[PDB]
Enzyme design. Structure first.
Site, short mmCIF file in Angstrom:
data_model
loop_
_atom_site.label_atom_id
_atom_site.label_comp_id
_atom_site.label_asym_id
_atom_site.label_seq_id
_atom_site.Cartn_x
_atom_site.Cartn_y
_atom_site.Cartn_z
N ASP A 168 -25.65 24.51 89.48
CA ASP A 168 -24.85 24.61 88.26
C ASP A 168 -25.52 24.03 87.02
OD1 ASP A 168 -24.83 21.98 89.02
OD2 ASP A 168 -22.67 21.82 89.28
N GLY A 169 -26.84 23.93 87.03
CA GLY A 169 -27.54 23.34 85.90
C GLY A 169 -27.45 21.83 85.93
N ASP A 188 -26.46 17.96 85.70
CA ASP A 188 -25.23 17.25 86.08
C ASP A 188 -24.40 18.06 87.06
OD1 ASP A 188 -26.04 15.16 84.38
OD2 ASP A 188 -24.99 16.05 82.67
N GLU A 192 -31.68 19.12 87.92
CA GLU A 192 -31.52 17.68 87.75
C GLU A 192 -32.90 17.05 87.58
OE1 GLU A 192 -28.59 16.80 87.29
OE2 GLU A 192 -27.74 18.62 88.17
N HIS A 202 -28.22 10.54 101.65
CA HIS A 202 -26.88 11.15 101.74
C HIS A 202 -26.94 12.56 102.33
CE1 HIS A 202 -22.68 11.97 100.26
NE2 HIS A 202 -23.15 13.20 100.16
N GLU A 203 -27.84 13.38 101.80
CA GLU A 203 -27.95 14.77 102.25
C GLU A 203 -28.37 14.89 103.71
OE1 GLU A 203 -26.67 17.16 100.61
OE2 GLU A 203 -26.30 15.81 98.93
N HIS A 208 -25.48 14.50 105.97
CA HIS A 208 -24.78 15.77 106.14
C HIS A 208 -25.54 16.66 107.15
CE1 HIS A 208 -21.60 15.20 103.26
NE2 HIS A 208 -22.33 15.32 102.16
N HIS A 216 -18.06 13.58 104.24
CA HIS A 216 -17.85 12.50 103.28
C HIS A 216 -16.98 11.39 103.83
CE1 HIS A 216 -19.11 15.34 99.85
NE2 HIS A 216 -20.11 14.51 100.15
C1 LIG Z 1 -18.75 15.65 95.25
C2 LIG Z 1 -19.24 16.92 95.91
C3 LIG Z 1 -18.26 18.01 95.65
O1 LIG Z 1 -20.44 17.30 95.33
N1 LIG Z 1 -21.58 16.93 95.90
C4 LIG Z 1 -22.11 17.89 96.88
C5 LIG Z 1 -22.37 17.13 98.16
O2 LIG Z 1 -21.46 16.84 98.89
N2 LIG Z 1 -23.70 16.75 98.53
O3 LIG Z 1 -23.87 16.10 99.66
S1 LIG Z 1 -22.63 16.37 94.74
O4 LIG Z 1 -23.75 17.24 94.51
O5 LIG Z 1 -22.07 16.23 93.42
C6 LIG Z 1 -23.18 14.78 95.35
C7 LIG Z 1 -22.41 13.64 95.10
C8 LIG Z 1 -22.84 12.40 95.58
C9 LIG Z 1 -24.03 12.30 96.29
C10 LIG Z 1 -24.50 10.96 96.74
C11 LIG Z 1 -23.62 9.99 97.20
C12 LIG Z 1 -24.10 8.74 97.58
C13 LIG Z 1 -25.45 8.45 97.48
C14 LIG Z 1 -26.33 9.41 97.01
C15 LIG Z 1 -25.86 10.67 96.64
C16 LIG Z 1 -24.81 13.44 96.52
C17 LIG Z 1 -24.39 14.69 96.06
CA LIG Z 2 -35.90 18.88 87.81
CA LIG Z 3 -26.40 20.29 88.87
ZN LIG Z 4 -22.26 14.96 100.08
#
Ligand SMILES: CC(C)ON(CC(=O)NO)S(=O)(=O)c1ccc(-c2ccccc2)cc1
Ligand SMILES: [Ca+2]
Ligand SMILES: [Ca+2]
Ligand SMILES: [Zn+2]
Ligand SMILES: [Ca+2]
Ligand SMILES: [Zn+2]
Length: 164
Positions: free
Chosen positions: A77-78, A80, A103, A121-122, A125, A131
């Site tokens: 989504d660009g 942010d 980003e 974090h990723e 998943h 979450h």
């Molecule tokens: C909130 C959710 C709808 O969106 N995320 C997608 C996602 O779940 N990615 O795993 S995110 O990209 O904004 C996002 C938000 C937070 C983090 C994160 C959290 C804690 C530590 C580091 C990153 C990573 C991506």
């Molecule tokens: Ca970049």
């Molecule tokens: Ca983005």
């Molecule tokens: Zn996440």
């Protein structure tokens, strides 16, 4: 706090492979390789899993930098908003991790988002964690820069539930 996907999806082998398909120009290639290696390291310590880098499309966890719609029906989504996403374990696109290259990827306090922290974090998943509702935890869905140890009790309890 911690959550799992609705089949409690998990890997059914211990030697997980990963492929860095492409790179962002935001950071040097060796800095990026090490960021990803450090993020896997957090998870390998606390599970029976190992992570081995390979150079193949048959890797379990394929890692890619991309922008907007990028081949999986879930467009970025660009700048942010969404930062990255990953799919729970299984074949093909499953287990893969994508980073929004619209980003600015960095390490350390300042501009951008820490590639290391977002990757940690990723990769959570991509091993099967959803979450967490515990605000202190890596799997809590809010990015906050920190210099401290990323894993929380809730994260370790979750990953133990799946692989422990
Ligand atoms: C909130 C959710 C709808 O969106 N995320 C997608 C996602 O779940 N990615 O795993 S995110 O990209 O904004 C996002 C938000 C937070 C983090 C994160 C959290 C804690 C530590 C580091 C990153 C990573 C991506
Ligand atoms: Ca970049
Ligand atoms: Ca983005
Ligand atoms: Zn996440
Ligand atoms: Ca995969
Ligand atoms: Zn994607």
């Amino acid at each position: 706090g911690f959550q799992t996907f609705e089949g409690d999806l998990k890997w059914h082998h211990h030697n997980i492979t990963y492929w860095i398909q492409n790179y962002s120009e935001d950071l040097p290639r060796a800095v990026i390789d090490d960021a990803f290696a450090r993020a896997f390291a957090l998870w390998s310590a606390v599970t029976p899993l190992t992570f081995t880098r390979v150079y193949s499309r048959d890797a379990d966890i394929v890692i890619q930098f991309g922008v907007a719609e990028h081949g999986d029906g879930y467009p970025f989504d660009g700048k942010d908003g969404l930062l990255a996403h990953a799919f729970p374990p299984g074949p093909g696109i499953q287990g893969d991790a994508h980073f929004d290259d619209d980003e600015l990827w960095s390490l350390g306090k300042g501009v951008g988002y820490s590639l290391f922290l977002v990757a940690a974090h990723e990769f959570g998943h991509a091993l099967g964690l959803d979450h967490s509702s515990v605000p202190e935890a890596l799997m809590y869905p809010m990015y906050r820069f920190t210099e401290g140890p990323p894993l929380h009790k809730d994260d370790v309890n979750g990953i133990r539930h799946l692989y422990g």
